Design a protein around this ligand. Structure first.
Ligand SMILES: OC[C@H]1O[C@@H](O)[C@H](O)[C@@H](O)[C@H]1O
Ligand SMILES: OC[C@H]1O[C@@H](O)[C@H](O)[C@@H](O)[C@H]1O
Ligand SMILES: OC[C@H]1O[C@@H](O)[C@H](O)[C@@H](O)[C@H]1O
Lengths: 520, 208, 104, 208, 208
């Protein structure tokens, strides 16, 4: 039986590699404070202040906290990630299992200047999950507060809030208010534990690999095509340029002219920014020259955007302005931090099937030619989907989000998150948690007013999340060696992906998932 | 139903994102404007800069017509300025068009020229009948997931910047489907059609 | 097979539509052109104005070349004026391209 | 088994709409103080003071508190009330179920000017119901102290008192005195929980 | 059942001499502090200081402690050792059994200059064994911190750290980092106890 003197569960961290399954598990220690003094609060930002029309919001901030495991580094050690990306073409989640156990609840009081903390054995916590997705789904927005990458850290559970329809800072009629105490939840004292299971809906494998062929080179280099193209519209070698239509079969000599079955993926352009500083223009174009989408009178920066190659061949230094995910190095400020602090991810590997983010999709004609008028060809900056078009989804990273919730809507086109991940119509239910309020002593004479004086309190405990991943084994006849993800051979001041002198864990670089090759 | 959340506001208002964006390309506060790349995490302060998983539905623009008469231009643009599609040498007005929000917030009076269904009140003539006779339907509720019919889908770059050349961003009037894109179908009405026959063809995109 | 109907002509030629469109934005027949919004039901008279459920397939344009030689321009536009797609710094001619009617 | 380290019950708030039944449930957190320093007290108001003859009363105020859920907003969210009144001609209660659980009992002491509060594990509370209606029935007079409309609020249990026959401020011979400790009650420590069921007598539908 | 008010196990010290077996057992009382403020820390020594090239190392010091019984005087009284070496040519271990029980966990706080210590009933400890030898094996290097020779002493559990490949004070590419929280372990409160059994692989008799 449960009690104050017996542990609720055990610590578990493993990666179990068996066949095509890998079961990763993680346990952490968390601390859940008391938010908003147990109050729901309207929060809003209007254009009245220095804010612009784009930054306005209306919403509510609750007392409730929530768990976010949505980042990969929670479920994989850098070595477990290395086994994954080196040996395997694809992986997708199957089922997860989630546990709260070993709950301590502690009341803290202030006496003069001295602080003291003591167990409260009879206090509870409230934990429910939204299984039916009846709440704003706050995960998948790439917010902070995930379980730490490194198992020895204790983390703080983030506060739960949500945004709703607004006009300016004011609320419209369709604005919703959700009281989270209005769901059924389970109340746990120090001997109780919480668990539930979840099973992912069938989702296409994330493809971890690069194509060994570019999309336009799928041809045979040896043989000509039996198809013809229009090579020359003008009489060649003659003293007069009188036009004549001349046709040719494309072949190894001109491959750019061959007929092709397929087209590159869709293109929505980005601005090009060079890491070398003297090359970039002198001005601030970050917001002005940005690639934005205009929704309901608010210009929203497009980030990261559709999956598009970062740069073409032999340009390392250029990157799309908003196009790439950007991770900070350990201990990076939140405002105007220098380039050296951020870690820019880059897509090299989708250059084959996808257009470069910073260049035009192609060129089309702007006019109908005549003997009088010359042909004029316009550039295509933005290109939607066309039949016979293929593309790769953005690469997942060890620091990046695992999944996102496909919004519930009439229609969607290739519903996969632009941050990368697994688009899910029913993602893992988000788990809400709160400290049940304990009143401070009420007055001796009745008063209707609600009790505003509470015991300062917080709770800590252990959380385990165990995800079962399905693997797609690499089977390939390639003769020569693959590229692998390998740690540096040369000596270092301190080990990568390990604690420093002071005890601070750090991840040196983002690790993309695609080192393997396939035939396109 | 209507969505209680706009598509870009799906974020948590409380918490910052661990992702970074490029906030400022130029040295700030210095006497010289020498360029430097500076990055920032988006947060409650700037939501417009956060990274987002999803994009608004496709956009094929309409002309904007105001019910208040003095605001509209003086000319007949109904046919000329119309949004048309050209099929086999015949220009066919696009009506009602793809599902797109009628108007943005706090504009009641504007409506897309061909964008909305228009029903007549009882006993309305068939030719050049006045505004007061027709009943204009309006989509308020798809403003969340869908772009406004009378405004641009967004803005993209027209050039590759250099120290010599300034960045130039062009408007996107028409936008086809892109991955990670969500939209709502047009609302059915009590007077409107129940169904239509999907033509028999090799292919179709979201056949509604 | 070919379709025996064009996509925009799927309508009934006999009957008017109960839907309205914006026919005229300006006062007609008056000495002053002060704007007024006037609406009309589309019908057999103007079919191009009727409301339609469906749209033509996607379009990625090509350059027009005439078999009659004197009509074409005098220059070599075959490669230059071509419709190309740009993939990884290489311009690749779009051939044959998306399915689109050859000529009207 | 019950204990100091295991919760007595779980939080529940729902409206279950099934057929012709709707089962509404509500959970709140309450705080019950110590009234009258554990004393029964005669209370009365005479015309001797500024009071008039209409405002005179005689009665007793007990230490006991009581629960009042008698207002609708306790059992319905404004949305659940909207489903009710829009879609339905009438409604009447059938049965109710009532629970006390997760009881914390805390002793507070004064030392100089500083206050401190600490669990008392061995202390109890006394909870009975009057099933046979042998007490003055104090509900239905529209007094304050109901469960809050909004589930996140903590509320204070009101004191129980009652009025009896009087002449002026003085008591007549038929005045009754009820000692509430004279009923059987159930005594609960922090691991104990209290529950009972009740079934409404057949009553005509409220006509909405 | 376990609880705060019942002991987990009993004290045992014996030497049972039966035939060709001698079963020695020992019980001690230990105290396990908090090392490194719950931090893993790189530790290294370079030749930059007064150190020479021979004394350089690179490694990590963990929060974890460990038990070392590896010395004989832990398992034998000087009399039990005398029976052994006088009467016998050889001895080899067969199996061992290991137990943690009667766990007290205590939180200590500082107020001005006065110290106070009080039970924390709900706190745990984490105990695992490496059965598969997946850690640096730190025993057998003749370090201090073994159970005392004399049963009445209380001893302090030593901190666990390990050394890895280095070049100077700097780490090379094959340097390994082991996070000890990454193993499955058992978490014990004051009523829980820990035990496991082990059986020695066949080994030649020590020749005495
Ligand atoms: O002045 C530059 C700023 O312009 C604002 O419109 C925007 O909210 C900021 O993200 C930044 O771009
Ligand atoms: O003069 C205006 C008219 O122009 C025609 O081309 C069209 O058939 C009519 O619908 C109207 O637009
Ligand atoms: O000079 C005309 C030629 O231009 C080249 O770029 C191309 O490879 C040829 O296909 C042809 O277009």
């Amino acid at each position: 039986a449960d009690g104050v003197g017996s542990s609720s569960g055990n610590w578990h961290c493993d990666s179990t590699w068996l066949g095509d399954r890998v079961i990763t598990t993680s346990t952490r220690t968390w601390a859940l404070p008391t938010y908003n003094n147990h109050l729901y609060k309207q929060i809003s930002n209007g254009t009245s202040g220095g804010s612009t029309n784009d930054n306005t919001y209306f919403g509510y901030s609750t007392p409730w906290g929530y768990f976010d495991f949505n980042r990969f580094h929670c479920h994989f050690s850098p070595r477990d990630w290395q086994r994954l990306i080196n040996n395997n073409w694809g992986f997708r989640p199957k089922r997860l299992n989630f546990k709260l156990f070993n709950i301590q609840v502690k009341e803290v009081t202030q006496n003069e200047g001295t602080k003291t903390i003591a167990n409260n054995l009879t206090s509870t916590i409230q934990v429910f999950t939204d299984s039916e997705y009846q709440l704003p789904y706050v995960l998948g927005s790439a917010h902070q507060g995930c379980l730490p990458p490194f198992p020895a850290d204790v983390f703080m559970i983030p506060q739960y809030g949500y945004l709703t329809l607004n006009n300016g800072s004011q609320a419209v009629g369709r604005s919703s208010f959700y009281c989270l105490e209005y769901f059924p939840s389970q109340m746990l004292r120090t001997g109780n534990n919480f668990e539930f299971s979840y099973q992912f809906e069938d989702v296409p494998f994330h493809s971890s690999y690069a194509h060994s062929q570019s999309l336009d080179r799928l041809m045979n280099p040896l043989i000509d095509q039996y198809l013809y193209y229009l090579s020359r519209t003008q009489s060649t070698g003659g003293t007069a340029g009188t036009q004549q239509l001349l046709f040719s079969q494309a072949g190894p000599n001109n491959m750019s002219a061959q007929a092709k079955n397929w087209l590159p993926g869709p293109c929505y352009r980005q601005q090009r920014v060079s890491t070398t500083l003297s090359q970039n223009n002198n001005s601030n174009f970050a917001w002005t020259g940005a690639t934005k989408y205009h929704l309901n009178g608010r210009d929203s920066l497009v980030n990261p955007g559709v999956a598009m190659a970062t740069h073409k061949d032999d340009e390392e230094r250029f990157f799309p302005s908003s196009g790439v995910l950007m991770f900070g190095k350990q201990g990076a400020g939140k405002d105007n931090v220098d380039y050296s602090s951020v870690m820019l991810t880059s897509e090299e590997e989708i250059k084959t099937t996808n257009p470069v983010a910073t260049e035009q999709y192609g060129v089309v004609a702007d006019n109908l030619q005549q003997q009088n008028a010359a042909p004029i060809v316009g550039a295509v900056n933005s290109q939607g989907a066309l039949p016979g078009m293929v593309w790769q989804n953005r690469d997942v990273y060890l620091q990046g989000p695992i999944w996102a919730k496909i919004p519930h809507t009439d229609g969607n086109f290739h519903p996969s998150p632009l941050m990368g991940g697994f688009g899910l119509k029913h993602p893992p239910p988000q788990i809400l948690i709160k400290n049940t309020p304990v009143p401070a002593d009420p007055p001796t004479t009745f008063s209707q007013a609600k009790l505003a004086s509470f015991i300062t309190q917080y709770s800590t405990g252990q959380v385990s999340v165990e995800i079962e991943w399905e693997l797609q084994k690499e089977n390939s006849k390639r003769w020569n060696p693959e590229i692998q993800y390998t740690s540096n051979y040369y000596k270092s001041t301190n080990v990568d992906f390990a604690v420093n002198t002071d005890g601070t864990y750090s991840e040196p670089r983002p690790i993309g998932t695609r080192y393997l090759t396939r035939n396109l």
